[PDB]
Symmetry: C3
Subunit: 295 residues, 3 copies
């Protein structure tokens, strides 16, 4: 048997099909079994429409055997395109051996596995092309768009393997596919899922700036608007200031800015380096939470 063939076969039981249907519409995606109690991680875009209109939508999980089981939404994070589902009392569930995204290196061979019984399902092969690559992601519906610090791959990520796992050559999940190919790393996923499972919510830092990218001789995220009462207006950030370092992550554009704000601690003090009218200023800002009552 093939080396790639042995690995895809070893994980197909852990990959499931997610089907959300209404009276007149239906969406479909893939997901992965992470916990034996019945916890299934997928993307947020796949189920976005079951959550914004639950009175008319119903979500079911189809396993490798064709067994179709109703599912309930545990929690969802539109800012990491992640989501957790739960099926109840289902047994003999083959859980996925999750790996460490910190040991992944560029050039390692991977497999973007989709759900075996999915309609347009796909199993693609490639390598890890880049690590810690910010990527803009379009938010489905009322949801907000976001930027994620992702694992890039030349394996094709598409509608047939989105929400399924990025698998290494030891059959371990090192990322979650999102729909040249980008994946949400497993180390961020294990953290988002723990909070989504225990609380039904994940709280993320906010500063209150909108940014546009700039690249010349002076490069980073240029300020478009500072909100009133925002931690940024209190910290001294001004319109048309250029941010080049947030906390300790240097920032090359607006996309890396979004990623670096999420890496800050809420309510702790953070250095923010700015170039204003040709002078270097290092300000200090305390990040607010995006949902106070839930923090």
């Amino acid at each position: 048997a093939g080396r790639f063939t042995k690995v895809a076969a070893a994980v197909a039981d852990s990959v499931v099909t997610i089907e959300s249907v209404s009276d007149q519409e239906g969406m479909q995606g893939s997901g992965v079994i992470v916990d034996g109690r019945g916890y299934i991680v997928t993307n947020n875009h796949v189920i976005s429409e079951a959550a914004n209109n639950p009175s008319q939508f119903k979500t079911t999980v189809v396993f490798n055997d064709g067994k179709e089981v109703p599912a309930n939404l545990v929690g969802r994070d539109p800012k990491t395109d992640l989501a957790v589902l739960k099926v109840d009392n289902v047994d003999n569930l083959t859980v996925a051996r999750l790996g460490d995204s910190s040991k992944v290196r560029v050039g390692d061979e991977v497999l973007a596995v989709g759900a075996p019984l999915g309609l347009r399902s796909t199993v693609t092969q490639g390598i890890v092309s880049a690590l810690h690559r910010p990527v803009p992601l379009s938010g489905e519906g009322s949801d907000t768009d976001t930027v994620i610090d992702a694992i890039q791959t030349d394996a094709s990520i598409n509608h047939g393997n989105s929400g399924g796992p990025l698998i290494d050559m030891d059959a371990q999940v090192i990322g979650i596919n999102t729909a040249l190919g980008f994946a949400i790393p497993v180390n961020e996923m294990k953290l988002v899922a723990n909070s989504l499972i225990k609380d039904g919510k994940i709280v993320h830092p906010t500063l209150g700036i909108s940014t546009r990218s700039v690249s010349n001789a002076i490069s980073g995220a240029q300020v478009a608007n500072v909100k009133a009462g925002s931690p940024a207006q209190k910290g001294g950030i001004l319109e048309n200031d250029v941010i080049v370092k947030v906390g300790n992550r240097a920032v090359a554009d607006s996309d890396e800015f979004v990623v670096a704000v999420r890496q800050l601690a809420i309510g702790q003090d953070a250095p923010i380096e700015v170039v204003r009218e040709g002078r270097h200023v290092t300000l200090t800002v305390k990040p607010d939470p995006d949902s106070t009552l839930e923090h």
Copy 2:
């Protein structure tokens, strides 16, 4: 030498260039030698225009040595995008070892080989991503479009390897490329070719329904039109009925419907499962042949 390099070299003699030229136009594609008598299988789109206008077009086969030999059309099937050519009295022809498409598994490494002396020829690599995947295919010219139950691959199928073979790691033809990558499986090809060689024609079942896809909570192929005298109008199929199983192949959309009708036996009785006004009806239809005089 490379593992992929050894395999592409072992099959290049069996892959040929097909050149169809008129006074002011010229098409080009790839093909494969399947029989030592000089039988060459290609796609139907490649030669479509030599067959609909033969008085002005001429088709020649260019071998690996640059030897250019006139060719004649044995038969063609627009519904499987397949076609057979014959060169006469050419000797020392290296025939392709044809494999079994039923032993192919997802994740097996493949090679989409094009014709060595072709203009924009390409040799691409990848894996088998999906099996038994219906795919719509655009029919060139007066020809009809069709849907084929195909082998999907992430190896790029394009103008430079269409009509050439999908090769496994034992240098065996497991499919015929058609122009993310789809291939006509060798087991369907061996059957279509046998009929095209012995009869110059292949007869396929027809029922007389036009279908549009639907996906909601009730999913399959919805009836748009039933022809008069069609086996479907006789079997009781009605407009706005939803087909979910044809024969014994469940049907998820209009594309799988087209594929499942071709799997029925002509003149034999076939169960057809339909959901009408929220009620489940199982009808019975006898498939007609698309060409009576030839059946």
Copy 3:
């Protein structure tokens, strides 16, 4: 460690980031260290804008360690999309082991390496799909477009690995990436670079014809215009003549014509085969240099 992972790691020190910036703009690409004196080969499109407007642009080379060093343009060839840069007094430079593009075969596994510290950098994997494939290339700015006799690959060539090397499985540069994937072969690069280093210029043959492609029953490069005083008008080439062989390279279209003219010797006599009004004429032309004073 992975087999592809070991190879990309072994060459990352030789691959550098090239950054050209003005007051309001900035371009970025990749390059490769070919000589220990500090000679760096990239594409011409990457630096095109530092050369046409040098009073406002500044080019710097960023190494694997983040060490940022100013760079100077040695020479550039818009017709092979090649360019040479020089950094001065930098030591401990890890040079790339350059290979032989004449020993490369179709199906050999390759890696399209980009600059590690580049913004949108990518490391892609694939195989050599075709050899000696002419490809049109769009010239940036005032520069002219060209056609190059290239190494085609299914590894994705993009903004993140353009100018970086095409690497074989022995970690040797067999080509230079240019932005389904095409690369400038190392054997042409070693020649262009030697002239660009020693002279700051490369002189290429010209004949003075503009050509459009034609394919029918008679195929090659059709003449659109012959310039006055051009070696072609002196050699007898006429408008609406069809060129099928230049020197000893047969020509299938206008793109291979461009490639074959560059293979001729300047000031030497060359056979040019033409089909005119259905008759075969073999003319004789002496190629001029594109820059006389520099030849």
